[PDB]
């Protein structure tokens, strides 16, 4: 349970922002605002949901909001470091339909509490 540390605003290297709650269960839930240059669903909440267990987080999106649908979602797997300079260090998997088939897009975002 890294629930008091986990909760609060994070800020990635793209300049997108979550709030999240760290229950002592294990529940995650907040919301999302992505602002990576050039991507859809920017600047506006969308839901965030997901799980830790000590260390280790998951939390996903779905791009649909009363804003904006962007027909996709992204699930986030990582670790917390907690103390001095505290980190959420995460691989993400963005997935949608393609024209051809099934579509994944991968990438690392590093998450911060400094703004
Ligand atoms: O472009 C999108 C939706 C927005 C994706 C934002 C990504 S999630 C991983 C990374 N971290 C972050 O903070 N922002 C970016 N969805 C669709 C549009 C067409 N194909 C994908």
Same mark, same amino acid.
């Given at each position: 349970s890294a629930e008091a540390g986990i909760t609060g605003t994070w800020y990635n290297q793209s300049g997108s922002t979550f709030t999240v709650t760290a229950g002592a269960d294990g529940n995650l839930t907040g919301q999302y605002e992505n602002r990576a240059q050039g991507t859809g669903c920017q600047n506006s909440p969308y839901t965030l949901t /997901?799980? !830790?267990? /000590?260390? %280790?987080?998951? #939390?996903?999106?779905? #791009?649909?909001?009363? &804003?904006?649908?962007?027909?996709?979602?992204?699930? #986030?797997? *990582?670790? !917390?470091? *907690? *103390?001095?300079?505290?980190?959420?260090?995460?691989? #993400?998997?963005? &997935? !949608?339909?393609?024209?051809? /088939?099934?579509? &994944?897009?991968?990438?690392?975002? &590093?998450?911060? %509490?400094? %703004?």
């Open positions: /997901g799980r !830790y267990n /000590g260390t %280790k987080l998951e #939390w996903r999106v779905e #791009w649909n909001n009363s &804003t904006e649908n962007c027909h996709s979602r992204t699930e #986030w797997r *990582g670790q !917390y470091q *907690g *103390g001095a300079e505290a980190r959420i260090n995460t691989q #993400w998997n963005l &997935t !949608y339909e393609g024209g051809s /088939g099934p579509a &994944t897009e991968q990438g690392q975002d &590093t998450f911060t %509490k400094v %703004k």
